[PDB]
Amino acid sequence: PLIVPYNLPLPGGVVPRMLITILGTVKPNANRIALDFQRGNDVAFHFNPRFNENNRRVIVCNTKLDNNWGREERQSVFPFESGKPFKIQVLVEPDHFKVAVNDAHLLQYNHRVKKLNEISKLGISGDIDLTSASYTMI
Ligand SMILES: OC[C@H]1O[C@@H](O[C@H]2[C@H](O)[C@@H](O)[C@H](O)O[C@@H]2CO)[C@H](O)[C@@H](O)[C@H]1O
User: Fold this and answer.
1) Cβ 19 vs Cβ 89: under 8 Å
2) Coiled-coil segments, which residues?
């Protein structure tokens, strides 16, 4: 078991073919989960499943540059469930991050922050118990 908010260093930054695997359980009555890939103070890729946003379940993706959020990308396919275990996989590809939850493809986020080698921290927060956070090269 790991403490949330959790900070996972990505030594040397992200690189294509890097695979991050996050295992946890969603807390009962969860409101939000967030993954934040950080380049310093900037958030290169924010992945933010919201459990109740006007009585809708929704995934928000965005980038925060110089403290300003940009244009949001919204996915209404929502594979998370309160109280239940999940696996999130982020595969880094040349042009996008590819996210799969519970072995099923969820979304792609085109790279807005282009200096991939400077995205060197992954922050994990929200209404989860965190079992495992790691990476490997596929
Ligand atoms: O965009 C990610 C960012 O959003 C914030 O909430 C947004 C909200 O989604 C939007 O509809 C409203 O107009 O602006 C808010 C602030 O930009 C969250 O507060 C923040 O945590 C991020 O998740």
Assistant:
1) yes
2) none
